[PDB]
Design a protein around this ligand. Sequence first.
Ligand SMILES: NS(=O)(=O)c1ccc(O)c(NC(=O)NCc2ccncc2)c1
Ligand SMILES: [Zn+2]
Length: 257
Amino acid sequence: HWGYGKHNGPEHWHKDFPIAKGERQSPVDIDTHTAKYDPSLKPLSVSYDQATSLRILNNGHAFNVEFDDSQDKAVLKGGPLDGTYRLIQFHFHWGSLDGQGSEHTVDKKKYAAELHLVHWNTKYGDFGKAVQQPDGLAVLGIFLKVGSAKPGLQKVVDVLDSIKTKGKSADFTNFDPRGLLPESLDYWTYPGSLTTPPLLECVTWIVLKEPISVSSEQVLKFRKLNFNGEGEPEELMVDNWRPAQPLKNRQIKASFK
Ligand SMILES: NS(=O)(=O)c1ccc(O)c(NC(=O)NCc2ccncc2)c1
Ligand SMILES: [Zn+2]
């Protein structure tokens, strides 16, 4: 099975998931000079006040903080989106070094990590149906650079010792995802895909211009996770990012000029 190693990493995924070579694959490089400012883009509406986190899970590729998505508690609307998308989970991708780790790049620049807040279009009833649809998901992507700590991330960092290995989960209630958001909600947007298998072309990507800063110690704790299950040989969970894919005939739009 697929992963991020030398024999099963991103360049291998197309053998099991042929859509890996598709027409709207993610991530991509965001060339900020070819991005098109679109005055008709609405501001993003992020309504996380009622969010209910439930638990945190090491799935062998990243860790997911999962939310109750059985009601409109934490929703994303506006921006390029029609209708309401519900937060189901967030996770991150990160590097072995501070100089790499993000999936999207900005003018070929790589950030230390990238946060994905995953939301599904409520008109499809649940996440499983939504991923089968071209407008099924909206993923809000936020870059992390290494600098000052992000206090709102610390509760995530502190529980990672409880989920070191693949398949481990821990109760993780009352986490407020608003503490992971940068000041500005200026964004780029383009149609794309999940960045891990099954690589389905179901995502409206919304990538924030402004990164959040996290401390070196915070991202180091990410790197102490393991891809392997307990009692298997230890392989650090680092470099769990897919590289940029061809833009093909897509234009990236910007909400700001
Ligand atoms: N990166 S993303 O484009 O925001 C994204 C958003 C929502 C997703 O459902 C996926 N993809 C998966 O969930 N794949 C199954 C899986 C992945 C990792 N480990 C175990 C199982 C990727
Ligand atoms: Zn992701």
